[PDB]
Amino acid sequence: SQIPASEQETLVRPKPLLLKLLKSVGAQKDTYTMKEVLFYLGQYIMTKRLYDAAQQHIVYCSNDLLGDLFGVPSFSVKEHRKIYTMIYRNLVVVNQ
């Protein structure tokens, strides 16, 4: 397999729970770039209004698909490496 041009361009196949979350916001495919996964996760958070309205770096997700994926009731968007760790557990890397 070729090394991706950037981390954002890594090709991935979401595992079933994460794929269900993506499809809930309109995703149609089984394979995505990491950047695409991050955009659909942002769209899920905004359309379901999960961010704290006053402190918008905090996300509340207790028991929704997202909280079940990440295994937490809330998280801070500022915890970049923690969020990536949680996302990666829910992906398989694929060729190209």
């Binding site: 990491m34 991050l38 996760l41 905004m46 968007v77 970049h80 990536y84």
Partner: peptide
């Protein structure tokens, strides 16, 4: 800062 802008700083 908007959630949109915080999340833009991940990718």
């Amino acid at each position: 800062t908007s959630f949109x802008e915080y999340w833009x700083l991940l990718p």
